[PDB]
Amino acid sequence: XXXXXXXXXXXDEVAVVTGASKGSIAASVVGQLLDGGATVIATTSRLDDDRLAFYKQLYRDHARFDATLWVVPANMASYSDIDKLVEWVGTEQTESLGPQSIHLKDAQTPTLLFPFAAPRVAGDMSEVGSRAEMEMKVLLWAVQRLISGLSKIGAERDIASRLHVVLPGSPNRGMFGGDGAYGEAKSALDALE
C-alpha cells in the first residue's frame, strides 16, 4: 500500500449537491463522488451536530486524494438562501488575515449540480394540503432560480464551462397512480428541457 501510494494519481470534479442527508440516494452519490477524487458542496437542512458528525464520518471513509468536502446549513425554500449561497459559492477563494479573521467567499465553478433536496410531508403546524403548492416553488421554480443563479455567476465571471444539472425526474409518469407525489410533479421537467 505504501508502494501503491507513491504512484497514486487523482482526478478533479466540482459538484454542488442538495438533499444529501443520511440514508438517501444522494448520500450514496456523495461518498461515491468523494471516491472519485472530486470537490463536493454538501448542503444540510438540519445544522445540528448529529447531522454534522455524519458527514464527517462519511468523509473520513470515502475521501480520496485531491478530495475536498464542504458542508453548510441551507434551505432551498428560501430565495435569499439560494442567492446568498451561490454568492458565497462564486466569489473569491481567498482568506484575508488582518487584525481579524475574514474568509472571502470560496469560488468553485460547479461541474455537476444535484438538486436532490426532497421536502417530506410533516404537518405539525397544520400545513397539510398546501404543501404540494409550496413544493412547486422548491422542486421547480426555486431550482429554476438556482439554475439561473449559477448561470449568472458563470456568465459574470465568464466561464464557458457547462454546469451539468442532473434533473431528478420521477420514473414513468402516468403508469402509476399510487405514488401520489413523484409521478405528477416531475412531468414538467420535459417542459423545463
Partner: protein, 48 residues
C-alpha cells in the same frame, strides 16, 4: 399584514424566514489528517 396573512396562510410566512448566513460555513479539506487516523484504526483492529 393581516390581509397578507389571510391570503397566504399561517405556515408560509413562518417557513420563509431566513436561515443562511455566511459565517456558519464549515470546510473540510483535510484528507492528510483523516487518512492517518483511518489507517492506525485498521492496523490495531485487524481481525479478518
Amino acid at each position: 399584514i393581516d390581509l397578507v396573512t389571510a391570503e397566504l396562510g399561517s405556515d408560509w410566512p413562518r417557513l420563509v424566514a431566513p436561515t443562511f448566513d455566511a459565517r456558519k460555513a464549515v470546510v473540510f479539506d483535510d484528507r492528510w489528517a483523516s487518512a492517518r487516523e483511518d489507517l492506525v484504526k485498521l492496523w490495531l483492529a485487524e481481525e479478518x
